[PDB]
Design a protein around this ligand. Sequence first.
Ligand SMILES: C[C@]12CC[C@H]3[C@@H](CC=C4C[C@@H](OS(N)(=O)=O)CC[C@@]43C)[C@@H]1CC[C@@H]2C=O
Ligand SMILES: [Zn+2]
Length: 257
Amino acid sequence: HWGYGKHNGPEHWHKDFPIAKGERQSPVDIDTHTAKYDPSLKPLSVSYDQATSLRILNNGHSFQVTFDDSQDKAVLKGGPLDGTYRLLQFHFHWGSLDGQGSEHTVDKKKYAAELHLVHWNTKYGDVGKAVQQPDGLAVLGIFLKVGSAKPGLQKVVDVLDSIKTEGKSADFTNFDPRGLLPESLDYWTYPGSLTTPPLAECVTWIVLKEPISVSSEQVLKFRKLNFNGEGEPEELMVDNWRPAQPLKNRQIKASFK
Ligand SMILES: C[C@]12CC[C@H]3[C@@H](CC=C4C[C@@H](OS(N)(=O)=O)CC[C@@]43C)[C@@H]1CC[C@@H]2C=O
Ligand SMILES: [Zn+2]
């Protein structure tokens, strides 16, 4: 029922999910001059060498690549985190044009798109339990700008024609998400939420300062996806981003000076 349109979009979500107006909602604008350098923050540990991708899916709000999270094969640790977070899936948010698409903004700057790698805390045993906990999830956010192609993204772009409409899925084995990472793991971090329903306040956000560059041809392929099911009027899958929410009583911390 919820979506990104005039009648069902982010301004409507609070009616089915009242936590939409809560104290720790995401995304937010990252004010770079107000974010505090925290020399206590550790380097982020990204261990994706044994990642096992399974499927790529159009879920009617994005597309996601899903991983085997039944063992510690692809894990996020350190940075602001206590303990071990398993990679469940990655997905993107993007715009109708290059000047919008990111969920987080930097000094009010919007990027063409934003990549989210979703991880859950192994101390809670499964992701359904983890979303009920204030430290249940860690989402690694990476900005996309349009320029040079990202070679590591091309395998994803080339299969999108096979999952054009909602619920369509395909085999997507042996995909290496290390090919989506920028050089630097310098980050901002703050306590927040899922950015779609159910908007659960379970997320430690880790947003990388360095964007990756993707080509216009790569992002054009995102914009050919459809929100609609096969045979329905349909409706290009574009502008699937929630706008920045009030920071309220929260501090954004920087890992870097
Ligand atoms: C599957 C669930 C509902 C959907 C939840 C998932 C946890 C995290 C994300 C990531 C989020 O996007 S974002 N932008 O916040 O990272 C989109 C929603 C989604 C897929 C839940 C785990 C349990 C729950 C129902 O069984
Ligand atoms: Zn997301």
